[model samples]
Target: LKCNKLVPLFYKTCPAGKNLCYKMFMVATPKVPVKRGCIDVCPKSSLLVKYVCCNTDRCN
Candidate 1:
């Protein structure tokens, strides 16, 4: 599906680096604001803006 916001697919390690690690039950947007649907989700890291919205089952 077309994620409406900064969509972040979870992984076991690389978070999509390999098909094995790419295993997410749902999607995850940013916890900070994405001014332009621009997703720079700093994985293993964090962005300073509060995200708006994205389709994720447990986006916590």
Candidate 2:
């Protein structure tokens, strides 16, 4: 699958077979920080941070 990551926006391709795209958001000083990538497993969300897992290309 293809996923987006980091600042300035870039793309990446994951290995074959079942995989997932993930987007994580964190509370920071002035702005909320964001991240995205591929993952085999997704972590649980919290009060200050959150995670999202999706299927399909660039789903995150």
Candidate 3:
């Protein structure tokens, strides 16, 4: 599938804990090829080959 959009994943701070909110971003593009080998090695099936962001408060 051709991916040409950005996906934003968000997470909040742990309730009753001294932590901050967090956000993650993922960018998908056809120019970037997927790495099947890496995906195969992932235990959680969460390995991504596209652009990603972390600890950001906002996404665009």
Candidate 4:
């Protein structure tokens, strides 16, 4: 999936059984940077940031 600053925009194939795309947005920053990649699981959301999960290409 395509993403904003903070990490690489692309990655190798996800590990077996890890089929979800993970994306995190940092609301604390002025530019509101976002992070995206592959993950086996999703993460939590908080007051300062947001996390989302997906199941398809570029879903983030």
Candidate 5:
């Protein structure tokens, strides 16, 4: 439960529209630890929206 200042999470879901996109998907934003969470999605369409926090100066 915190802000890493360098990392960011961009979560988008368009189940019905089918236009979901993410800037950081299933990758580390850069750190010693990676976090994963569950969502309570009752989508009206077909998009199974999911993502991860990641970014910056080459997160290696």
Candidate 6:
């Protein structure tokens, strides 16, 4: 999956560090809703939800 839009303004002051170079990644199972309380709290709307093959190296 790919995210192309600019990061949302709300997360500009994130404690994690500089904004521009940071890439936030999120993975969820098919049964889970992508939009949840955790996602809702993300100041930056940069959150991305993608499906990973169960047997793939990246999947847990």
lDDT (Cα atoms) of all candidates against the true structure = 0.29, 0.75, 0.27, 0.62, 0.29, 0.28
Model 6: how far residue 8 lies from native, Å: 6.4
> lDDT per residue, candidate 4, 1-60, as tens digits?
322224543454564646777777777766364776667778786877787777766545
Q: Of the candidates shown, which would achieve the greatest lDDT relative to the real structure?
A: 2
TM-scores for every predicted model: 0.18, 0.71, 0.21, 0.59, 0.17, 0.18
- Local distance difference test, candidate 1: 0.29
Candidate 3 local lDDT, 1-60, one digit each (tens): 111222343233332442223223233434443321111112232444433322223231
Instruction: List pairs with backbone clashes in candidate 6.
Output: none
Off by over 4 Å in 1: 6-32, 35-42, 47-60
User: 1-60 in candidate 2: lDDT tens per residue?
Assistant: 878778766877776733888888876444464777778898876767778878777666
Over 1-60, each residue of candidate 1 has an lDDT whose tens digit, in order, gives 223223464221222332111112222453333332313242332343333333342232
Candidate 5 weakest lDDT stretch, 10 residues = 18-27
Deviation from native of the Cα of residue 12 in model 6, angstroms: 10
Error of 2 at 60 (Å): 2.2
Q: Candidate 4, which ten residues in sequence have the lowest lDDT sum?
A: 1-10
Error of model 5, residue 28, in angstroms? 26
Q: Pick the candidate with the highest TM-score.
A: 2
True-vs-predicted CA distance for residue 15, candidate 3, Å: 4.7
For model 4, how many clashes?
Answer: 0
Candidate 2 lDDT score relative to the true structure: 0.75
